[PDB]
RNA sequence: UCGGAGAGAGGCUCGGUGAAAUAGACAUGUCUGUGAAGAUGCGGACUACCUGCACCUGGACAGAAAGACCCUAUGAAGCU
RNA sequence: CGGUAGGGGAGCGUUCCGUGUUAGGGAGAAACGCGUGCGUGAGCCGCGUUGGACGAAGCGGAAGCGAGAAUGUCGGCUUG
RNA sequence: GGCCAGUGAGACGAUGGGGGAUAAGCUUCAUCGUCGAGAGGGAAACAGCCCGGAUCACCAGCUAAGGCCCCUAAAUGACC
RNA sequence: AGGGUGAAAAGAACCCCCAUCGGGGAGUGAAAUAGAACAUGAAACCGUAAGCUCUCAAGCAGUGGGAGGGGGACCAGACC
């Protein structure tokens, strides 16, 4: 903002303070195919006989993974279960309940989601306002026409944790009605499915 | 609500409004400049312009009205003597209001009022 | 220590008023220049300004007299309002029940510093870069070293604790 | 400073500190670089060591071993200070080129080490409580602990490779 | 009515700062009034 | 001989107060509350240190389980432990969980040695 | 109307987890052979 | 029925002076369950940016008076 | 070697007396404020830009001797 | 036997019966278990039910009752 | 109900603010940061400044984990 010799000096010291802080600090190592230790961190604290708690430089949100899930004839709950496993990071060796070590997930063709039994006419999505008559019941099929996306969102939300982080984990999920999405630049991949009951 | 109500209440009943404004005009017309609040000064413009309007038509019927309004007797007789020569051309706006710092006791916004 | 040469302490002892009512005025004049407050305190709607107006004016009079400062180069650094001795009373009420009121009391402490005290040093030290500054202080002796840093150059730039790490300004 | 004694209220000036010459910053001469190394050193090479680690058992809990590095362990009967100690059972040895996986152990492997100190753990308060019963107990506990330094690892080369291709 | 419990220390301060915050808006009016009065051009405010 | 209370109540409560350093509100300022909370902190500390052991273990199972599903299909943590005792290994959850993050190439070799 | 609710401690007896399965109750820990005689954990060298 | 308008004193705003009952500490939501059987405080789900002002009082088994109704005491007192 | 009522055993600390006109103490006592020290703990041992004249330890002795509660209680200060 | 305490309001459950209406988280006895005086784990929360009786420490391991889709640790394991 | 300036009032000439009160220097004194409402001066309570930090939250307020940032006469894989 202001370009004065007084305030300009203040910005020069902090560049020097961060620089001196960077030299005697231990460089961060990426997890991909690393040996146990190095000559640098061997002089550091005992990260070996203590549990590995991740640093902020691990879950850098820019370079996170991205997946796709075509919901054309896919079971709802079983597809939602794995999506929670991938968003929470439970499949990674670097799992930590208090950190977002997981990944993103994209869902497409949400309106083509499969559903077993007669839940298409019996499962009641509902909500409440606060009045003594603010209860609004709604079936699967009625919600399937009005907003197809709340179906996927309402299921995964119940599987994610509840709290500060779980509300932060929800935004990592992207859902779409059509067979396309604008998230092409991120270069996602196809998501695996260990279960064998999802494809009718 | 007061929709369509143009009246200055001044936190006083009618008997006191009719006396308070009626009494200040007696002092302004003889002194020409006084120190009062802003609410009292704003309500004063309607009545001072009335008495001055009576002097332009300085008849006998118009004089008896000022005598009933103006308390003292000599100012009304002196008012009609000077106004036709002083305001023989002006049409309304016979006074101005100059703001002033408030008082020490109650922070009442004060202001002067004078005859142009 | 720069505080023992720049500013002056001035206190108002046993001013009969309330603490919180005073702080409506004191919290605003904090950080305002000398000429700025005088234009404001003479025009606020508050009653707490007339004691303060006598107190701000009296403090600057001491500066030009006891330390020879120019009025135009003053800035209110600190300003406090501490509790004083409260007198007590007893007022009757209904049903023979008695309630006590009190006349509060304040001890207002005000400070007035001068920016034009270290301009010979501070304006020079800030003109240099950080790296260029090291070689300057590294060649001179300690007596010349302690004096250039006795001002407020370090506080304004947040380098008080960093210089110890580089073996500069050793205790 | 000196003239500050004469008036203790007169303003300071720049000329009183130093002369107005300041012969040169000498930004290119090594003197300007030497004074930087005086107050701003660099990291430099870390302490070299052997590129190896191993797993070892003490008591009933396990530890990861690195040469030239120390670690706390459960108290050992005897084992005076500055005593040369050898840990026999090791569960694996790892290197960049290979990784030896103890079958239940690695045969004839050993870990030479040194006893740095024989100290007590930091106090932990064993506190017991039961509400509405006037039962309160405050007991500390200083656990006996030793401090071992590692020197090197030997006796593992005759084990097979079990490397990675 | 009667309060069930006492207000805390910081919840008290937050309510006092709002009362003190009115002084911020009163000081701006005074500064605007002075600078609008030290020029001797306003014919609507007699200060003496 | 008369005996005042003196200072024994003061020096006691300072020790009780110094423990309550970072407590919020009146839990760091009032003696009749700090004694009420200092009791609760140590009980919670003594309770957590017992839960401290099961908790890190619970984390190591996930990390080891999470780090091994990638190797083989229809393979899992429970089958990995059954083979170690068959192969007569001794490694615990601490070492396996940390190697999974610090030297992942080792577990790929451990999986091969088993098979 | 003439059927009580089973609300107190009886709610625990009726609703507590049970197995009721010979194949699940008959089970036990897994049996592995014993390991060889291992060496000691530490040994002193002359110092 | 069926309320409506108006005046005055308060209420509301500004300045000055300035209490009180009360108060385990309080970072003080709803639903439905649970529980000494009627929960902001435990469980699950839902809802909910932070902080004020003016208004209304359903709850905090609100405040106020160691229940004055009932019972107990080998209690007290008046009367027959 | 869980433990309420409750019983036993071993100890800490306060003020004062004996040794004692003790040691020490304006080269800073008591106190107050502190601590990467010690103890099963009550507490001990130490430190000081405070303080300005008293006073341990050890072997023993005596009590107006250890407080978080009694709609306690005196004084001081908050909440509203 | 000596010295010297507290207790003499019990609670749910199992069984054996009585009273009641083969009602009561009812009431009264007899024989056991637990809570009372008992933490921990399972039972969503939940003194009396199930496993099991906390000397202390360990970022070691095996198990009980009971469980292994996700929230939430363990086979989205196999076969009829 | 209300006790304690100091060895000695030497109780603060004089100058500035200044209607007083009161304050800042000067001077007195071992000490004035002992300045009269004055001795050591704990806590609640009211505050100023600095370091980290909260406006999608939820909670008897801590505890075990400890991201990012900060700090210092011992050192620093430590400690706050
Ligand atoms: Mg009025
Ligand atoms: Mg009338
Ligand atoms: Mg006593
Ligand atoms: Mg265990
Ligand atoms: Mg029924
Ligand atoms: Mg079993
Ligand atoms: Mg009306
Ligand atoms: Mg009215
Ligand atoms: Mg007011
Ligand atoms: Mg809230
Ligand atoms: Mg119930
Ligand atoms: Mg309820
Ligand atoms: Mg809670
Ligand atoms: Mg709730
Ligand atoms: Mg009302
Ligand atoms: Mg009530
Ligand atoms: Mg009663
Ligand atoms: Mg009674
Ligand atoms: Mg009887
Ligand atoms: Mg026992
Ligand atoms: Mg036992
Ligand atoms: Mg003494
Ligand atoms: Mg003396
Ligand atoms: Mg003695
Ligand atoms: Mg009985
Ligand atoms: Mg029978
Ligand atoms: Mg019963
Ligand atoms: Mg009964
Ligand atoms: Mg029992
Ligand atoms: Mg249940
Ligand atoms: Mg097992
Ligand atoms: Mg089942
Ligand atoms: Mg799992
Ligand atoms: Mg003092
Ligand atoms: Mg004093
Ligand atoms: Mg939201
Ligand atoms: Mg936020």
From Swiss-Prot, chain B:
Record bears the keyword Hydrolase: no
One GO cellular component term noted in the UniProt record for this chain: cytosolic large ribosomal subunit
InterPro entries: Ribosomal_bL17, Ribosomal_bL17_sf
Biological process per Gene Ontology, one example term: translation
Chief location: plastid
Annotated GO MF terms: rRNA binding; structural constituent of ribosome
Top-rank taxon: Eukaryota
Pfam families: Ribosomal_L17 (PF01196)
Plastid recorded as keyword: yes
Localisation: Plastid, Chloroplast
Keywords of this entry: Chloroplast, Plastid, Ribonucleoprotein, Ribosomal protein, RNA-binding, rRNA-binding, Transit peptide
Subunit annotation: Component of the chloroplast large ribosomal subunit (LSU). Mature 70S chloroplast ribosomes of higher plants consist of a small (30S) and a large (50S) subunit. The 30S small subunit contains 1 molecule of ribosomal RNA (16S rRNA) and 24 different proteins. The 50S large subunit contains 3 rRNA molecules (23S, 5S and 4.5S rRNA) and 33 different proteins.
Matching NCBIfam families: L17
PANTHER family registered for this protein in UniProt: LARGE RIBOSOMAL SUBUNIT PROTEIN BL17M, RIBOSOMAL PROTEIN L17
Function: Component of the chloroplast ribosome (chloro-ribosome), a dedicated translation machinery responsible for the synthesis of chloroplast genome-encoded proteins, including proteins of the transcription and translation machinery and components of the photosynthetic apparatus.
Family according to the record: Belongs to the bacterial ribosomal protein bL17 family.
Name of the protein described by the UniProt record: Large ribosomal subunit protein bL17c
Curated annotation (Swiss-Prot), chain C:
GO molecular function, one term: structural constituent of ribosome
GO BP, sorted A to Z: translation
Protein name: Large ribosomal subunit protein uL22c
Protein localization: Plastid, Chloroplast
Primary localisation category: plastid
Chloroplast found in the keyword field: yes
Organism: Spinacia oleracea
Record's keyword terms, sorted: Chloroplast, Plastid, Ribonucleoprotein, Ribosomal protein, RNA-binding, rRNA-binding
Function: Component of the chloroplast ribosome (chloro-ribosome), a dedicated translation machinery responsible for the synthesis of chloroplast genome-encoded proteins, including proteins of the transcription and translation machinery and components of the photosynthetic apparatus.
UniProt xrefs under PROSITE patterns: RIBOSOMAL_L22
PANTHER family the record matches: CHLOROPLAST 50S RIBOSOMAL PROTEIN L22-RELATED, LARGE RIBOSOMAL SUBUNIT PROTEIN UL22M
Domain of life: Eukaryota
Subunit structure: Component of the chloroplast large ribosomal subunit (LSU). Mature 70S chloroplast ribosomes of higher plants consist of a small (30S) and a large (50S) subunit. The 30S small subunit contains 1 molecule of ribosomal RNA (16S rRNA) and 24 different proteins. The 50S large subunit contains 3 rRNA molecules (23S, 5S and 4.5S rRNA) and 33 different proteins. uL22c binds 5S rRNA in vitro; the central segment of the protein (approximately amino acids 30 to 124) but not the last 28 amino acids are required for this binding.
Pfam families: Ribosomal_L22 (PF00237)
Family to which this protein belongs: Belongs to the universal ribosomal protein uL22 family.
GO cellular component: a single term: large ribosomal subunit
UniProt-listed HAMAP family: Ribosomal_uL22_B (MF_01331_B)
Curated annotation (Swiss-Prot), chain F:
Main location: plastid
SUPFAM superfamilies per record: Ribosomal protein L20
UniProt-recorded Gene Ontology molecular function terms: rRNA binding; structural constituent of ribosome
GO cellular component: chloroplast; ribonucleoprotein complex; ribosome
Protein keywords: Chloroplast, Plastid, Ribonucleoprotein, Ribosomal protein, RNA-binding, rRNA-binding
InterPro entries: Ribosomal_bL20, RIBOSOMAL_L20_CS, Ribosomal_protein_bL20_C
Location relative to the cell: Plastid, Chloroplast
One of the GO biological process terms: ribosomal large subunit assembly
Cited PROSITE patterns: RIBOSOMAL_L20
Family: Belongs to the bacterial ribosomal protein bL20 family.
NCBIfam families cross-referenced by the UniProt entry: rplT_bact
Function: Component of the chloroplast ribosome (chloro-ribosome), a dedicated translation machinery responsible for the synthesis of chloroplast genome-encoded proteins, including proteins of the transcription and translation machinery and components of the photosynthetic apparatus.
Quaternary structure annotation from Swiss-Prot or TrEMBL: Component of the chloroplast large ribosomal subunit (LSU). Mature 70S chloroplast ribosomes of higher plants consist of a small (30S) and a large (50S) subunit. The 30S small subunit contains 1 molecule of ribosomal RNA (16S rRNA) and 24 different proteins. The 50S large subunit contains 3 rRNA molecules (23S, 5S and 4.5S rRNA) and 33 different proteins.
Official protein name in the record: Large ribosomal subunit protein bL20c
From Swiss-Prot, chain G:
Subcellular location: Plastid, Chloroplast
Recorded superkingdom: Eukaryota
Transmembrane segment boundaries: none
Subunit structure: Component of the chloroplast large ribosomal subunit (LSU). Mature 70S chloroplast ribosomes of higher plants consist of a small (30S) and a large (50S) subunit. The 30S small subunit contains 1 molecule of ribosomal RNA (16S rRNA) and 24 different proteins. The 50S large subunit contains 3 rRNA molecules (23S, 5S and 4.5S rRNA) and 33 different proteins.
Family: Belongs to the chloroplast-specific ribosomal protein cL38 family.
Function: Component of the chloroplast ribosome (chloro-ribosome), a dedicated translation machinery responsible for the synthesis of chloroplast genome-encoded proteins, including proteins of the transcription and translation machinery and components of the photosynthetic apparatus.
Protein name, entry field: Large ribosomal subunit protein cL38
Naturally occurring in which organism (per UniProt): Spinacia oleracea
